[PDB]
Symmetry: D2
Subunit: 258 residues, 4 copies
């Protein structure tokens, strides 16, 4: 009977996790800024796995009223919340010298303030109902090791780790655990694929040589795929990981061991 | 059809893990300094899971001849080796001023040299058969933070981490992943129970208040259970954690979040 | 002939670092929200060290126009900049379920965006003039370990570590190094001294029990003092620490060793 | 103030002995090669004069030897203020070919010797009420596991663990303890001799080994003996009294955790 709320649910990784959770037997609130994508995914889940397994919702995670309204809506639809997945954030690269304040502010709003607001709202619902819940943030190796030309992304992602640990400490007395998943490069993803040019120029190499460059830094000699993320998420979300909380869990093929 | 070799399988945590592995489907090589405890545990698994599921072996993991003979005995018994679990080590508490060399040396032998020997012999078997195998070390929060009056235990357990990371780097090309599990206090274990009077003094409090003193340091407000151990182990040993290697996985109720 | 700019130089710790830097032989730009505080401390410094040693400047580090003007003002005044010290931001406590967005937001502006603006604008000066400069941020043990009831503060202080590492990588090619200093508790701060009541309440004990309570957490059995900060600051700002960059330097009396 | 340097009779260790004396320390220069320790202390004695440095023999892996060094320094100098532990050399092999004797040796030299020398010299500090300093020379391989160097990594990570436990045990006596996590000392004789192996370890020509490692480092150079000496002096000083139990990176930004 568990309910999963996925912020950033309407596309790519977030959308897969939504389908993955549904396949695992959760009911899913697909929540996105693009309501049309949210509802289109919810219908696809329902076509694939049965009636009423998902519902689509609009939220701007950066806005307090919007977050409050989503939580009200989710409660009205499903009556409980068990698992919050927060998926958001896109790195915009520039040397510190030329990094815009608007971009830095955006990174902070989308990766930190939205994470805060969604966590605060859904933990309240978990507490109300005596639910030993789970909060899982999608994060990055960039939240473990500073990324050259990506100060806004690293600052925001490091910050995510700090928030995950404060939330874990605040929420432990209610049986809610909180983690951040520190993902390696989703090399075949549409986002990674579209930046192969930009990487080529930062690294001084050809677009076609970028994926081998990054593969070669991974001990297991391959990039991360969405199923790697889902599988880790599933375990940490489950009752079997009840004694783990506040962690930065690496999913990096061994590239990060700290 | 996988085989798990559990070094330290004859008693307490290690026995619990052998049984749990068998519950999960594994054939189990119960390996132990006490061959009699090992053979008896194997008998118990066989009556519960069917003939030939488990066999007992003698090993002294500090002795190279003994470990090489264990790996040959496992190979002759089962087709193969898929998971190595290394479970050994008990802390001895003394201020550095009084710490004996013999005990420091023994902490290294048992916690580190044995881990190295077992990893070495069993990895050659995995490599021989092209098995995408698993090596899992039982370690401690004292391998994440040095522990007062436990210099020997901390040196050895931090050591185990370094070994894990090196082994992960050496074997990744063969699809073998390597992890350390950084356990909290196993408050219910017979060892922990026996030491209540010694910790009572060392702290400056009664025996009865020890468990609550250590429980209070934990955000989740309980001790580590054998089941928590087995849960985490089974995940990292599974094909669902194929993109994780070289890690220090905390199982601490949020006491350790770095 | 080096010039130090200290943001938040007009009182308490910032004021102590300004004096300490003048003593070490620096020209000091005292930058603060309170311009009269900035000017008077600079007068004190010139009354001891000679006219034109120190100048006071107004800055709102959270405002881009105010930071960009500060940089123009310092350049007009001293003609160069060698060391940026960013010393800003305070702790506001409340469990996540009552923690306000305004405060979370303010924490990010003061602790993080100010640090990004100041680093941006003074790095450009350092680059222009070919200076192998230093950027040092005042951070907290709360940027190493998440703080119960202090989500806004931990998020922002961890985010500072991330910004420090990305800065370091962006600026390495120019011989500029960047560090974050992870301070323990400044128990004899006015700040800390005035908050004894709240910690008393939060923890459940008389205000007279509060300093003892935090002391006993430190292995060195001492609170952090301003001179420890200065000491470490001076070393990492020196040409002796040229091969160190991107570091989170603990100044914690052994409370934090990771 | 007296400094004891283990492994002081050669290379980085020698460098450190010359630097501490220049910085104003009385040096007890201690090595397995007693001939080296004796003449480095006279190399030192022909610059800073006489009675400065003294050469002692020690097999840091041997309890008797280490305890005899501790009684001898107390006779020679009357006190101990700083212990520098400088030993250990990496032997490379894939785990599958790694010899036990080599693993055992790495632990004895890198970890057991550090334990023994910290134990003995810390007693001498406690006796004379000294708020002293124990500093270990370690490596980035004590921060991140090194491929084909299981022995060296296990040992060097071990040393961090020991550093932290020591710090916690010795804090009530005002003694601080740290490990220095060094980058590659590219010009050292050791590094220079092993370029062919590193070259065949990585599938490069020898001459292209150093630039392959320099390119890894955000500051774009190797670690220098002087970077080591600079950090040691700071953490060895009373200015660093509030720092203990740390792993201090000296890696040009290659390691930031
Ligand atoms: Cl945990
Ligand atoms: Cl990983
Ligand atoms: Cl560094
Ligand atoms: Cl510290």
């Amino acid at each position: 009977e568990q309910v999963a709320v996925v912020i950033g649910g309407g596309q790519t990784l977030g959308a897969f996790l939504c389908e993955g959770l549904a396949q695992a037997g959760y009911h899913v609130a697909v929540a996105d800024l693009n309501e049309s994508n949210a509802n289109r995914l919810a219908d696809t889940i329902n076509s694939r796995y049965g009636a009423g397994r998902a519902y689509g919702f609009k939220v701007d995670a950066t806005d307090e009223a919007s977050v409050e309204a989503l939580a009200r809506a989710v409660d009205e639809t499903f009556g409980r919340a068990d698992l919050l997945v927060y998926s958001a954030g896109v790195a915009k690269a520039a040397p510190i010298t030329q990094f815009r304040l608007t971009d830095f502010d955006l990174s902070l709003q989308v990766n930190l303030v939205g994470y805060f607001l969604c966590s605060r709202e859904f933990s309240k619902l978990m507490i109300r109902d005596g639910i030993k819940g789970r909060i899982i943030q999608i994060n990055s190796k960039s939240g473990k090791v500073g990324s050259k030309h990506n100060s806004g992304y690293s600052a925001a992602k490091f910050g995510g780790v700090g928030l995950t640990q404060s939330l874990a400490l605040d929420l432990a007395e209610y049986g809610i655990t909180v983690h951040s998943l520190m993902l390696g490069n989703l090399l075949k993803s549409p986002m990674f694929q579209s930046l192969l040019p930009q990487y080529a120029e930062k690294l001084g190499i050809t677009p076609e040589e970028v994926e081998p460059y990054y593969v070669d830094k991974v001990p297991l000699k391959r990039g991360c795929d969405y199923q790697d993320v889902l599988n880790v998420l599933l375990f940490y979300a489950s009752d079997k990981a009840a004694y783990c909380t506040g962690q930065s869990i690496n999913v990096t093929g061994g590239q990060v061991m700290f």
